[PDB]
Amino acid sequence: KLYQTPLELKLKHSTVHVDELCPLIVPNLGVAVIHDYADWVKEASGDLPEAQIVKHWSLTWTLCEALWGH
Amino acid sequence: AKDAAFATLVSDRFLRDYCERGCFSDLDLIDNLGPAMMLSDRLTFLGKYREFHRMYGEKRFADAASLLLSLMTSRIAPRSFWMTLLTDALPLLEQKQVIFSAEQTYELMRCLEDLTSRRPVHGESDTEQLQDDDIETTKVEMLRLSLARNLARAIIREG
Amino acid sequence: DMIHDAQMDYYGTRLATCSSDRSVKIFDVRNGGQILIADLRGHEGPVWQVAWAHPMYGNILASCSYDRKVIIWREENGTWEKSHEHAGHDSSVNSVCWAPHDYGLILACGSSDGAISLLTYTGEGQWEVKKINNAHTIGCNAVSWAPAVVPPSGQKPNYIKRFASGGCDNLIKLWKEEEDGQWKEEQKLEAHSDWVRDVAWAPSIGLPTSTIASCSQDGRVFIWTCDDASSNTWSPKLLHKFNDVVWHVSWSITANILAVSGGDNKVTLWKESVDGQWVCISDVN
Amino acid sequence: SYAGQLESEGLWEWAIFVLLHIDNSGIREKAVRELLTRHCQLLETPESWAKETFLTQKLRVPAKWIHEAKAVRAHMESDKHLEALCLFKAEHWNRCHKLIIRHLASDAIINENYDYLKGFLEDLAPPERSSLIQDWETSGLVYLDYIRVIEMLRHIQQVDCSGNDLEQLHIKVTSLCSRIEQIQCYSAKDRLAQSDMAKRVANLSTPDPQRVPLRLLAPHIGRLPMPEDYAMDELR
Amino acid sequence: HNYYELLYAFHIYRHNYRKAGTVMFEYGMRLGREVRTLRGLEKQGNCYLAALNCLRLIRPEYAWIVQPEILELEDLEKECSLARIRLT
């Protein structure tokens, strides 16, 4: 979450428009944030979330992608 | 009474009350202050100042006033009205021209140099010269300029 | 020796500190490095609180003292000279805060004689003294303004201009500016048992549920909140009860975490949970 | 909650992206304004890009608010002489000539560095023309005429005629300096800059006025109340 | 002859409109600032007295070049007070 590559990847997967001088998320199909959908599994390695608390996050992301995933 | 602390305070109050206008009157020829010898010889400065403010005899009165001011500015008669007396005496020297001071210009310069590096409080309505000023250093600058003019226009009188 | 109140500037710029030695030091914080710039001195009593102005009106910083006077020094070209000086109070000033940027450059100052001055800057350096007497019994002790809530034309929207003040009469009376020009007491909140120390209003982050925290000398911390807008219903809620008295009470802008400062010389961070009860996050120092 | 958690650590782009995905427009705009006012120099797109090549402009956000927030933060954290150039050149002033003129008055020293003052005076006209201003335009004109008068006095030392706009510039400088008498203003740096600009051109033309304010503030404040007519005070 | 030249310039200015004596005094003080403990203090006192006289004998608008008016006078007074406190 402290990298700019994730923000750049998440900003390109949404369609925003200027409405009354305010940006709103109209159409979105993915997000590269922490503990998201299928795009958050690649940002959880041994050099991003240490090693003592990465397996649980990966399992929670996989379960959410397999259950709440279309 | 107890010591000289009361006599010094009374002398300072008299000197502050006498210096308020152009002519130091108020308590003119009404000071006396005669007690024993040690407590009576300390009141000679006030008497000399009163005699110089009342009567005048060529440059003798000016020399006596300058000597009294130099003696009072040497940590003797306090230091409240000393700056005012010095500024009033420097206004009658040669602020607009050039004069002469035998055994007095160097003393006035030393007094102005010592009062500028220590503490200086001047508060006395003299005449038209004091009303046109603003800061306290203006009187010292005028006195220094007058002393320089006197030393430049009087030290070349060789025999 | 001992400092009283030290608030930051704008976006973490300088840090105006105030101690009991009548010295309003303005220290700069550059990358975590504390460095003093100037020492504004000109009060006969000890300095209490200090609040900085907005960046739209230059760089002003007002600080109250115990000499029955309020100094408002500016900052331009490295000259921290005093611009305005308000001394309309009879007793010592306890708290002195400013209003929002949308309403102008108003500054509310509470005294210890039961009055609340409101220095409203006009088109220049002239400030109108709009004080309101008979505001407290033993005197005011806290002053904080509410958030700027906006109410088919080309003009500025007139806000309600609300400001909740705390005093030593165990009543947090909130003020409201009428359409005539004078301020009046809207409602009172008598829920404390002793003298109210500090009472800062929580900033709304777009939600209409405006809250306001208060701290008294009895050790209780009340969090009065409103149910809806345009409804005089200030339901107080007890957050924590300590054995000692509390000093100041600040709130955050993101999660609105209440910073309870007081008790045994320690600061505690209180945050509202999902159940509605306030719990302590961690301990400072 | 996500925008607050992302902003409490130091991430501005993530916090802005989390706040932009809200429901209420009035709350989202306020959150975006608060996030821009809290931190704007760390994630700026224009003026030397260093935020991964346009980070806030790609989220369908206006660049006028971010630039204004960055200018307001620089005017409070950095100096006033360097923060005025980032506000007028950002194309988001909207009748902000008074703030620029007040900020540019801090660099009144260093007479040999008039290039920055000339550039500021030349750039202040573009913002006033873009913001549709055709009424209050005296401080910038006086500041532009002062530098030109100083340059003409430093280059030509034998000329002593009227410069047409010299009288208008002097009248504008006098009206700006008489703020304490017009609307009772307690300005210090601006008044000092105006006095310096009015006195730097008095050694060539005429300048009958431009002085101080009698003895009402010199013999009653601390023997110091801005010098002016020292020649008239020490001469006759 | 710097003092004589400054006096002549001040007289020529007063014989026209009188609006450059303070600027000349400020330029002279800036050119001859670093001196010693006694000479520098005397020069600072003379400059302060000249500035006070100029402020007392003037009444129109604002004119104070070579001085970064009110703020410059306050800074000069603070510097003089600091020098007097350090020398005593």
Residue numbers in the entry:
A (entry chain AE): 333 to 402
B (entry chain AH): 493 to 651
C (entry chain AF): 14 to 164, 171 to 304
D (entry chain AE): 671 to 874, 891 to 922
E (entry chain AJ): 1078 to 1145, 1176 to 1195
From the paper:
The nucleoplasmic ring (NR) shares scaffold nucleoporins (Nups) with the CR and anchors a distinct basket-like structure with diverse functions. For the NR and CR, we used a composite Y-complex model derived from overlapping crystal structures and threaded models. Bending at recognized ‘hinge points’, we fit the Y complex. It docks into both the CR and NR in a reticulated pattern of eight-membered rings. The principal Y-complex arrangement in both the CR and NR follows a reticulated pattern composed of two eight-membered rings. The NR is also composed of two eight-membered rings of Y complexes. In each ring, we observed considerable density beyond the Y complexes. In contrast to the IR, the diameters of the CR and NR are nearly identical to previous models. However, to accommodate a flatter overall assembly, the CR and NR rings flex in relation to the NE. At both the CR and NR, the Y-complex rings are angled more inward towards the central channel.
Nuclear pore complexes (NPCs) create large conduits for cargo transport between the nucleus and cytoplasm across the nuclear envelope (NE). These multi-megadalton structures are composed of about thirty different nucleoporins that are distributed in three main substructures (the inner, cytoplasmic and nucleoplasmic rings) around the central transport channel. Here we use cryo-electron tomography on DLD-1 cells that were prepared using cryo-focused-ion-beam milling to generate a structural model for the human NPC in its native environment. Our findings highlight the inherent flexibility of the NPC and suggest that the cellular environment has a considerable influence on NPC dimensions and architecture.
